[PDB]
Enzyme design. Structure first.
Site, PDB file in Angstrom:
ATOM      1  CG  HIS A 112      -2.422  -8.522   3.915  1.00 13.14           C
ATOM      2  ND1 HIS A 112      -1.431  -9.441   3.814  1.00 13.14           N
ATOM      3  CD2 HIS A 112      -3.241  -9.006   4.873  1.00 13.14           C
ATOM      4  CE1 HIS A 112      -1.596 -10.410   4.709  1.00 13.14           C
ATOM      5  NE2 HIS A 112      -2.711 -10.165   5.390  1.00 13.14           N
ATOM      6  CG  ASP A 132       0.702  -9.982   1.184  1.00 11.22           C
ATOM      7  OD1 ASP A 132       0.998 -11.016   1.824  1.00 11.22           O
ATOM      8  OD2 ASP A 132       0.188  -8.977   1.736  1.00 11.22           O
TER       9      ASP A 132
HETATM   10  O1  LIG Z   1      -9.864   4.212  14.438  1.00  9.42           O
HETATM   11  C1  LIG Z   1      -8.902   3.618  13.948  1.00  9.42           C
HETATM   12  C2  LIG Z   1      -8.569   2.225  14.092  1.00  9.42           C
HETATM   13  C3  LIG Z   1      -7.506   1.732  13.416  1.00  9.42           C
HETATM   14  N1  LIG Z   1      -6.725   2.485  12.567  1.00  9.42           N
HETATM   15  C4  LIG Z   1      -5.588   1.889  11.829  1.00  9.42           C
HETATM   16  O2  LIG Z   1      -5.947   0.581  11.400  1.00  9.42           O
HETATM   17  C5  LIG Z   1      -4.753  -0.217  11.293  1.00  9.42           C
HETATM   18  C6  LIG Z   1      -5.009  -1.542  11.974  1.00  9.42           C
HETATM   19  O3  LIG Z   1      -3.925  -2.415  11.599  1.00  9.42           O
HETATM   20  P1  LIG Z   1      -3.361  -3.498  12.588  1.00  9.42           P
HETATM   21  O4  LIG Z   1      -3.100  -2.939  13.908  1.00  9.42           O
HETATM   22  O5  LIG Z   1      -2.151  -4.176  11.939  1.00  9.42           O
HETATM   23  O6  LIG Z   1      -4.550  -4.529  12.805  1.00  9.42           O
HETATM   24  P2  LIG Z   1      -5.021  -5.833  11.955  1.00  9.42           P
HETATM   25  O7  LIG Z   1      -5.330  -5.353  10.571  1.00  9.42           O
HETATM   26  O8  LIG Z   1      -6.055  -6.502  12.748  1.00  9.42           O
HETATM   27  O9  LIG Z   1      -3.613  -6.681  11.823  1.00  9.42           O
HETATM   28  C7  LIG Z   1      -3.378  -8.062  11.549  1.00  9.42           C
HETATM   29  O10 LIG Z   1      -3.696  -8.391  10.189  1.00  9.42           O
HETATM   30  C8  LIG Z   1      -2.896  -7.639   9.204  1.00  9.42           C
HETATM   31  C9  LIG Z   1      -3.423  -8.053   7.857  1.00  9.42           C
HETATM   32  O11 LIG Z   1      -4.822  -7.815   7.784  1.00  9.42           O
HETATM   33  C10 LIG Z   1      -1.407  -7.953   9.399  1.00  9.42           C
HETATM   34  O12 LIG Z   1      -0.603  -7.210   8.487  1.00  9.42           O
HETATM   35  C11 LIG Z   1      -1.039  -7.633  10.830  1.00  9.42           C
HETATM   36  O13 LIG Z   1       0.312  -7.984  11.134  1.00  9.42           O
HETATM   37  C12 LIG Z   1      -1.890  -8.434  11.741  1.00  9.42           C
HETATM   38  O14 LIG Z   1      -1.313  -8.221  13.023  1.00  9.42           O
HETATM   39  C13 LIG Z   1      -3.591   0.609  11.871  1.00  9.42           C
HETATM   40  O15 LIG Z   1      -2.732   1.182  10.891  1.00  9.42           O
HETATM   41  C14 LIG Z   1      -4.316   1.712  12.642  1.00  9.42           C
HETATM   42  O16 LIG Z   1      -3.647   2.967  12.667  1.00  9.42           O
HETATM   43  C15 LIG Z   1      -7.011   3.824  12.371  1.00  9.42           C
HETATM   44  O17 LIG Z   1      -6.346   4.573  11.679  1.00  9.42           O
HETATM   45  N2  LIG Z   1      -8.086   4.292  13.066  1.00  9.42           N
END
Ligand SMILES: O=c1ccn([C@@H]2O[C@H](COP(=O)(O)OP(=O)(O)O[C@H]3O[C@H](CO)[C@@H](O)[C@H](O)[C@H]3O)[C@@H](O)[C@H]2O)c(=O)[nH]1
Length: 446
Positions: A16, A110
């Protein structure tokens, strides 16, 4: 000499705080007579904070996260944080006003922080809410009252949503964020999300890291529900980051060694989830069978538990790292498909690089809805048989995306969606224009 002072309150959990800081940095760049104070937990701030990120007009504050003075769980921490809110933020907003000499003129939070409305109302400033997911997830939440009124909490499946929610006719009740239906001794996060829904219509603007054109009908609907509904993304296209002179992970050097464009299967389930070690095994078998090269973001424990001799046999086929520079990976010409947990930031990164998706969503949040949209609305990827990475389900999904006529249609759809995202952030684009509107709201008459 600052003329306006924007307070920005983060939700310090999940993904977030980073997307909200990115929006603050974009606004600060364009707003040199405006001061921005960013309020977040000290633990979150230490993960977020070079030349392009040292702003003269951004101040960083820590707010009490509600923990005694982590030993307890992520879950526990979220509850304590919400119990300490909003007095934790209110006290620190006073300090920022005293330190700067400028009362707050606007409060961005947020969207989860429903009490941003109460803090803004008490101070006599606008409240702007930053939603951290896509329009589809926000729309699902906004229809919570009407959904519960129609079917209660405990015929409805595949009839109610298609009659009720513009642009979600392809979604099932069971795709929707589960917090919609959690109304029996709800946990603190479910309480917070349902109070958000009640307050968001009193926001001066709702802001999204999305683009209107991913879901025109949902966007039009939400424009009718909100004073200003401002898709301003994708941030990664509006505001690129210079390539770091190196990549200490080795991922990009490994992708550079690939001889076939669009051949590599990139696998990540996000920062938190690991699929169960029998599902990891099934995936490992599908990778060995299909002989696509792969780059897999997987923690070292889980890697050490993969089947005997899998790592030795695939030494020359795949690379497994505990962390990948995911946006840089997805932008690489060698990447052909992304096996994802369907987090919004991951989906949006994928769209921004024209990489189609294989969806393995887990419980909670908007992941299952995002998977539905990916397969049945956006049509930029496929879901799995049984919603799991079984060997047969994985071999099937890789065949559908990588070597089928359905696959060629998916790749034209993700390329077209990439083009719409790029147009949105360029001059005259929907996100470009919405971001100028946001600047007009925050910077006021000047
Ligand atoms: O090896 C890795 C793995 C992940 N990432 C990054 O990690 C982030 C993961 O974010 P996301 O894909 O949104 O996953 P979650 O955090 O599980 O997302 C959920 O939860 C978020 C809040 O925690 C919300 O904003 C999202 O909409 C919701 O879908 C991304 O920017 C990726 O690029 C890396 O850079 N390297």
């Amino acid at each position: 000499v600052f003329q306006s002072h924007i307070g920005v309150l983060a939700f310090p959990f999940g993904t977030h705080a980073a997307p909200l800081l990115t929006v603050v940095q974009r606004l600060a760049t364009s707003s040199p007579h405006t001061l921005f104070s960013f309020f977040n937990s000290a633990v979150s701030n230490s993960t977020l904070f070079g030349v392009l990120d040292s702003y003269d007009n951004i101040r960083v504050y820590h707010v009490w996260d509600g923990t005694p003075q982590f030993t307890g769980s992520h879950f526990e921490a979220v509850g304590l944080f919400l119990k300490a809110s909003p007095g934790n933020f209110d006290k620190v907003i006073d300090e920022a006003e005293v330190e700067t000499g400028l009362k707050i003129s606007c409060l961005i939070t947020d969207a989860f922080l429903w009490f941003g409305y109460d803090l803004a109302e008490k101070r006599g400033v606008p409240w702007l809410a930053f939603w951290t997911s896509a329009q589809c997830a926000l729309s699902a939440h906004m229809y919570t009252h009407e959904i519960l009124k129609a079917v209660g909490s405990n015929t409805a499946e595949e009839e109610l949503i298609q009659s009720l929610i513009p642009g979600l006719e392809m979604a099932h009740l069971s795709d929707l964020p589960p917090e919609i239906f959690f109304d029996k001794n709800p946990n603190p996060l479910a309480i917070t999300i349902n109070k958000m829904v009640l307050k968001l219509p009193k926001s001066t603007a709702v802001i999204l890291n999305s683009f209107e054109e991913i879901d025109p009908i949902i966007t039009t609907d939400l424009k009718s529900k909100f004073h200003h509904f401002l898709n301003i993304g994708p941030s990664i296209l509006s505001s690129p980051t210079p390539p770091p002179p190196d990549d200490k992970t080795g991922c990009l050097a490994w992708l550079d060694s690939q001889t076939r464009p669009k051949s590599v299967v990139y696998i990540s389930f996000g920062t938190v989830i690991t699929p169960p070690e029998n599902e990891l095994a099934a995936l490992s078998e599908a990778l060995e069978t299909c002989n696509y090269p792969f780059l897999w973001s997987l923690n070292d424990r889980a890697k050490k538990s993969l089947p005997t001799g899998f790592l030795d046999r695939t030494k020359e086929l795949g690379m497994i790292v505990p962390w990948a520079p995911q946006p840089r990976v997805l932008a690489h010409r060698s990447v052909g498909v992304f096996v994802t947990h369907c987090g919004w930031n991951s989906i949006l990164e994928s769209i921004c690089s024209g990489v189609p998706l294989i969806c393995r969503p887990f419980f909670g949040s908007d992941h299952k809805l995002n998977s539905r949209m990916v397969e049945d609305s956006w049509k930029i990827g496929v879901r799995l048989e049984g919603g799991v990475l079984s060997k047969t389900a994985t071999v099937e999904a890789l065949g559908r995306v990588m070597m089928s006529e359905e696959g060629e249609i998916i790749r034209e759809n993700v390329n077209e969606m990439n083009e719409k995202a790029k147009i949105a952030v360029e001059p005259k684009g929907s996100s470009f224009k919405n971001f100028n509107k946001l600047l007009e709201i925050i910077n006021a008459p000047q």
